[PDB]
């Protein structure tokens, strides 16, 4: 039954920088993590945005439009957990 030990955090980032959100999750079985930004499922497809190991989401060449509410979802057949944080790009 999944539980988020450390969720993403509030940050101010510079434009053109690289930042991450991380979501450390425990449970059984190992909880898969997803990312939503402003209620919508983040597109790893856009090649700035990278789902890396140990539940990290990374965003390179930061843009003003990356400001928003990023949410971590940790999921198991049992259930899911939520933890969100706010990113401000300037």
């Amino acid at each position, epitope marked *: 039954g999944p539980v988020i030990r450390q969720g993403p955090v509030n940050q101010t980032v*510079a434009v*053109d*920088g*690289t*930042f*991450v959100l*991380s979501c450390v999750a425990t449970g059984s079985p190992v909880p898969t993590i997803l990312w939503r930004k402003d209620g919508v499922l983040v597109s790893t497809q856009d090649s*700035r945005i*990278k*789902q*890396l*190991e*140990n539940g*990290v989401l*990374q965003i*390179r*060449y930061a843009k003003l439009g990356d400001t928003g509410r990023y949410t971590c979802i940790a999921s198991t057949p049992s259930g899911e957990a939520t933890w969100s944080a706010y990113i401000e790009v300037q």
Partner: antibody
Amino acid sequence: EVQLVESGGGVVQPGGSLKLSCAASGFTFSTYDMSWVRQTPDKRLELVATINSNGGSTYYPDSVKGRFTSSRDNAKNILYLQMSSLKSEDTAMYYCAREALLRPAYYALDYWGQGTSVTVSS
Amino acid sequence: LDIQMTQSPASLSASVGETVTITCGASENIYGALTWYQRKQGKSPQLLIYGAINLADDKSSRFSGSGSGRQYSLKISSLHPDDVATYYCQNVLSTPFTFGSGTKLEIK
């Protein structure tokens, strides 16, 4: 055979300008992000510029922001770094490096050029 | 605000055939977003490890990268004379993408 080849280094006065080149061949230059990294006499290293495939995104650390401009030319395969307001702490060997294509897609540089020497003062 | 990478030791001399560990510390948890480079004298660096644990393609398995969280290590097994170089770890989590100062590996 992949080749990266920096030119245009040399000695300049404090406050001066410089324009470095990097000729690339033996790979698809238009597919890759490139980096500019330097090496101070103390043997420390420091990433100073990154540029993306088509040249539409650039990043610079605080130490060189505003003074360093990076640009590319994907027709003739060259990478440039323009340096102005140059300071003594910019004396360094400058490398042209390629961004690897990986899984998971971490930032790593798989190929480096052999560098061009840059010195600042008197 | 910037993320420190510290490298232990500064330098060391050891003997052929030995195993030798170089450690890299981050002022914060960098989630294995860490890369290793080898620089021989008069040469540009070369990628050794990426993502903390993944070995580069045309590089000797004598090299192993390990670690998680704040603490990382590079082990060189059965020391060869061609391993003489400086080794540098780098934070590729968030910018600035700082390098550790590096570690000069010498043979006795």
